Amino acid sequence: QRRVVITGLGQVSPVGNTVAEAWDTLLAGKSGIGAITRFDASDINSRVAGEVRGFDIGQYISAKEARRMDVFIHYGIAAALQAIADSGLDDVENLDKDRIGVNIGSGIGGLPSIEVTGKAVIEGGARKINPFFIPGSLINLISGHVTILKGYRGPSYGMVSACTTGAHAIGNSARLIKYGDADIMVAGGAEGAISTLGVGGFAAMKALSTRNDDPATASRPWDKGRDGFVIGEGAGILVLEELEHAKKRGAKIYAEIVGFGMSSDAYHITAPNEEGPALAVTRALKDAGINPEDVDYVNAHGTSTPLGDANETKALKRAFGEHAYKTVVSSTKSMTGHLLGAAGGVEAVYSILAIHDGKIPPTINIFEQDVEAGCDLDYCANEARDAEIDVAISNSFGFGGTNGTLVFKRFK
């Protein structure tokens, strides 16, 4: 019955501090990956990352309060306020704030502040713990701060699903609105784990690229020379709004979310198989009431891992059949790196912008496509395309074998 459209976009990421900066960067095929500057990473086998740069949280909230939060909350709050400003909700007279909720997740949360506080305790004891240590690291406090800043009293919580966090949050928020528990939801993911334990943790898994002499081409999905993903940070946020509510005020509408699919591999904890991801894609298309052939663009999970990229391709073939060769796929992680919990968030934004603008962002750094390994689809290599996008799907296949697929559609 109830339909859910997108009326606001918010983004902070390695390719831009606003939605416009990012889109322009992505369409130009420019990388957001560089050498790690956040901390001394000389000891980690991976020393490259997608870092947020030139970003001032003080533009959004007070510096004194910002001081008391870990940076993943900075990214979430900033991207949320962007999306809210973008939707025009701050200018609606007699807005029913009781019907507005916030659902923003994170994969890992306040790892950098936990590391800092830990070092403080070792050196100084338990009395060096700041009074704001715990709220400054709690994942759900992103939603907490946003509701307090805006006076929203609808449902608020965070999700955690590793790489799939942002997808689950957005899909779940859409469910909430349809069920009637809210008319508006602010949803997405935020991540800030560029730290010794964060970067070093995934490196210990041998999951990260070690192309430290060529940062710009470290992330290269479906390329022959790929060797692991490049860690990234930031946040992507949507404003989801019930259609009639959107149309009553004169809201600008980017797209409609028509489908949400979920599955579990039940196989490996940190390596996606074929069937699990295929299930999620299938379930999402069913939920949307559309067929594979209707899908014009797939924003892939596309981590640039040897097994993952190839397994995702096989998963698409299972779910799409022959249309896997007709549709267009692309991984924006080729430019942004892998934002983990925030990945589903920013890539939802990009998918929606693809529909809205009629443009597909490229998978850069495809020098020799890995056809031998089965990666023989159209990954929109190396250059963006003008394309009529009516339906776009965004995939997220995360650690724990948890899968999510969002289905967006042009609104007319």
Decide if residue 148 touches a second copy (CB under 8 A): yes
Q: How far is the CB of 142 from a second copy (least distance, A)?
A: 9
Beta strands in 213-347 (DSSP E): 234-242, 255-264, 297-299, 328-330
H/E stretch holding 190 reads strand 184-191
Residue 386, class by beta-carbon neighbours within 10 Å (0-12 exposed, 13-18 middle, 19+ buried)? exposed
CA distance 91 to 94: 9
Which positions from 189 through 208 interact with a second copy, judged by CB under 8 A? 196-197, 200-206
Alpha-carbon separation of residue 70 from 6, 53, 54, 64, 139 (angstroms): 28, 16, 17, 13, 10
Q: Which of 157, 318, 326, 359 binds a second copy (CB under 8 A)?
A: 157
Per CB under 8 A, 394 contacts a second copy: no
Q: What are phi and psi of 189, to 5 degrees?
A: -145, 155
Tell whether residue 122 is a contact of a second copy (CB under 8 A): yes
- Distance between CA atoms of residues 243 and 236, nearest Å: 22
Confirm or reject binding of residue 181 to a second copy (CB under 8 A). Answer: yes
Q: Which of 48, 60, 86, 145 binds a second copy (CB under 8 A)?
A: 145
Number of residues that bind a second copy (CB under 8 A): 84
Nearer to a second copy, 53 or 286 (CB): 286
Within residues 234-293, the interface with a second copy by CB under 8 A covers 262-270, 275-276, 279, 283
Marked catalytic residue, from 36, 163, 194, 310: 163
Contact between 219 and a second copy per CB under 8 A:
no
Give the footprint of K ion on this chain (CB under 5 A): 299, 347, 394-395
Part in contact with a second copy (CB under 8 A); list of ranges 111-119, 251-259, 349-357, 386-394? 111-119
Query: Cα–Cα distance between 302 and 288 in angstroms, integer?
Result: 23
Chosen residue from 1, 64, 93, 179 binding a second copy by CB under 8 A: 179
Is residue 163 among the annotated active site residues? Answer: yes
347 binds, among K ion, a second copy, none (CB under 5 to 8 A by kind): K ion
Span near a second copy by CB under 8 A; candidates 4-12, 87-95, 175-183, 357-365: 175-183
Burial 336-355 (b: 16+ CB within 10 A, else e): bbbbbbbbbbbbbbbbbbbb
Which tokens in the block code for residue 130?
Answer: 């700041």
Q: Which is nearer to a second copy, 126 or 388 (CB)?
A: 126
Give the C-alpha separation, 347 to 363, whole Å: 13
Q: Cite the DSSP H helix spans in 258-305.
A: 275-288
- The 3-state DSSP class for residue 32 equals coil
For a second copy, which is the closer residue by CB, 228 or 361? 228
- Which of the listed partners (K ion, a second copy, none) does 299 bind, with a CB threshold of 5 to 8 Å by partner kind? K ion
Q: Which residues participate in catalysis according to the annotation? A: 163
